[PDB]
Structures are given as C-alpha cells and as structure tokens.
Amino acid sequence: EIPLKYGATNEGKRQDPAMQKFRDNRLGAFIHWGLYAIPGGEWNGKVYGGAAEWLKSWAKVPADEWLKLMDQWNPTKFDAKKWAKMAKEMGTKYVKITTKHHEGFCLWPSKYTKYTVANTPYKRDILGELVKAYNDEGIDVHFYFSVMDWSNPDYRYDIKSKEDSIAFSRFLEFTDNQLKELATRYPTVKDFWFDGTWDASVKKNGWWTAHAEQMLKELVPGVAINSRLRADDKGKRHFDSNGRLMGDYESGYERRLPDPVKDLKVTQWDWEACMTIPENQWGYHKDWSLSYVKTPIEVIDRIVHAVSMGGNMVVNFGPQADGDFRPEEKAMATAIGKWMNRYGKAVYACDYAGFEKQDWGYYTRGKNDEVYMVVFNQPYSERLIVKTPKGITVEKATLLTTGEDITVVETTRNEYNVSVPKKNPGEPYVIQLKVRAA
Length: 438
Ligand SMILES: COc1ccc([C@@H]2N[C@@H](C)[C@@H](O)[C@H]2O)cc1
Prior knowledge:
It is classed as hydrolase/hydrolase inhibitor. By secondary structure, the chain is α/β, with parallel strands linked by helices. The protein has helices at residues 17-25, 55-58, 63-67, 80-90, 126-136, 162-185, 200-203, 206-219, 296-308, 327-343; strands at residues 27-31, 42-43, 46-47, 94-100, 140-146, 191-195, 224-225, 250-252, 271-275, 311-317, 361-365, 371-375, 383-387, 392-399, 405-406, 408-412, 415-419, 429-437. The two termini are 40 Å apart. Ligand 1KN binds next to loops.
C-alpha cells in the first residue's frame, strides 16, 4: 500500500445527486470548435489526414501565424438556441464544449490572454451563449479544457532547468486563473474534462492536478472532474499507484469500448467514452472521405454498449467555421434522436444488468428492475437467447414500442428463447423483460 499525498480522493462511486445526474444523463454530445475549423485540415493547399484540430502541429505553423486566424473568426450563422434545439432533438442530456483546445484560443473572453473570442470580428462570448442556450433546454454543460497550450510561451513539455521550472510555475498560475474564471463566469457548469495532461511537466507536478480538482470542487458544488486530469506523487495517471481511480469517473475508450465479456471491471466505477464520427477527426475537417465514417446504427450500437456496461457515451461534433453543422452531422443527430425517442427508456437512467452477454445485442437495466434487451443482430433462428443469473426468472416480455406480448419459452434450467417480434422492426429494437428474483 504505497502512501500518497495526491492519489485517489473517492473510494467507490459518488452517489450525490449531481453525480447521479451525470450518470443518468448517459447520452451527451461533444463540441470541438476552435480556430482549426477555419482551415479545416488544409494548410497552403495541402490537406492533412491527421486530426484537423492538430493541424498547427502537422503543418508546423508558428503560433503567431496560427493565431492570426482569429482575424477570420466570424461565424455569422452561429445561433446558440438553434444548437441547443439540435441537441435537444438528438436526445442528448448534456454537451461537453472545448472552452480552449491545445491551440489556446478561448471561446470565452478570458482576461488572462488576448487569444480569445473578444479579439475577433465576431466579438461575442460563444461559450456564454451556449451555456445559456443549452441550460434553457434543460441540458447540462461540461467544459473541455486543454492544459497543454501552444499559445503560451511559458508552457513546457518537460522541466530540464530552473528556467523551465520558473516558466512552468507561471504557466500553472495562468492555468489556475483561467479555470477559476470558467468556474465563476459559468457557474452552472457540471463537469471539467481535462486534456493535454500527459507531458512529463504535468506528470512531474501531480500535486497541481489534485489542487486543480480540489479548487474546482470548492468553486462549483457537485462538479465532476475526469480521470485524465490526474497524476499522483509518482506521476501515474488516471489510476494512482495503488490502482485507485483518480477524479470522479474514468475517461477513455475513445478508440475501443470495454469488451462486454472480459472488461466487466469497468462496472465498478463511473466512466465515459467519447467518440468521433470519422475514425479520428474531432475538429471540423473538410474531407471526410479520408477515413471510415460511422453510420448512425454504428454509433447507436456504441451508445448502448456503453450503457450496458455502466458508462456514458458522448458523440462528437466539429462545427463549421460559419457556425453551422455539416450535413452528415445533422443527419446523424436526427437519426439518433428518432431512435432515442422510440427506445430511450433503455438508455436514460440505465446501467449494467448483470446478465451474461449474448450475440443479439445488449442488456440494460432500468431504475425499477426493468431489463431491456436491445437487439442489433437479428437471429435467423428467430429466437433470442437469454441466460439468467441464478435465482432470476423471466416472467414476461413485451415489445417496448407497441406493448405487444412476446413469447418466452424456457429451454433449460437458466435459459430461455425470447421470440423476435411478429413483424421485423427493421432497425435495432427493444424488448422489455419483467424479471423476478427468489
Ligand atoms: C494520441 O494523442 C492524442 C492527443 C490529443 C487528442 C485530443 N483528445 C481528444 C478528445 C481531442 O481533443 C483530440 O485532439 C487525441 C489524441
């Protein structure tokens, strides 16, 4: 048992109302919007296949020159109420917003740097307007923040000297000032999601990560903080050197979700996956033909998969420079919202059901012991196998959308065949089980 000043703070899941709301939300959207939306992955006639929000790096653009993009920041089609409506229709319960990405351009009028929205033709506090607009739709708002900041010369990747070390303290101070500003200007914020905390400079200053979490929790009651912020005394990140989760929930599973058979350990803590629609574009990139683009059913599968394992899923959007959304993204949000509007009773406020995974899809459990079968792979057998845990029996099955009764047959001791519906629903669909325990 290694002793640590800056390791894990929670032991187990938070059960306060604010974390319960975080959890019960389940479905969110991510907004990556920044100066990178203007060049859209293209610099001086070259289209880069890398993530558009890292274009500064790929095209080796100097900061002075990258930040001059502020002169072009004027999203005349931007309308916060329209964004909030789109989110509401999609069925999202929260939105995570890049307040500042690695480039260091702030979407709120920070007084601690001139690289902000206030110094652009558009002038307006984009972040403030989104906060209000989402909140008026009853949508929670979470703040992405990049500690790594390519706009501030005090930033260091490592500390190799007194001069580094001095510069970096000033950088941490600046960072604290920005975070305080965010927390006080936008007091309805429910979460800070840190990024760009993997450099040796940050790993060598875990104390700062614990301080940042504490400071923010003091300023914003109930706020959630992600694991990626956090490094312990030994520089170990996400989980401390005793294997205990730091922050309030695990943030990962960006490429791959936990395996539904081998990774059941995740059910023991809150966690949240965030995904891109293309393979790896978060900011707006003009050419989506460069990588595979997920269809709505692929995305819905991922959303349900996360909830079936006690996790939230967040779907990313990279708005256009003009302040509108590209057609693929509007289509995606609409598809998802139609599906959520028929089947969201099996997503919202649901969790791990404790049933052995089957090939036809996923189980989720409702707040009142409902067990939902979410079918993504329709068996030619027309039989959906359900293997119950010891002492559990299935008393009824019902098609969620129509209420029709669905036949359940016991095949052996802890096992049933739940028939598919009389008419193929033609999309992923839900059957609700009434189950009874000894
Ligand atoms: C493997 O290196 C990285 C570094 C930064 C990222 C950033 N985290 C995502 C959520 C976006 O903000 C992306 O640019 C992704 C991968």
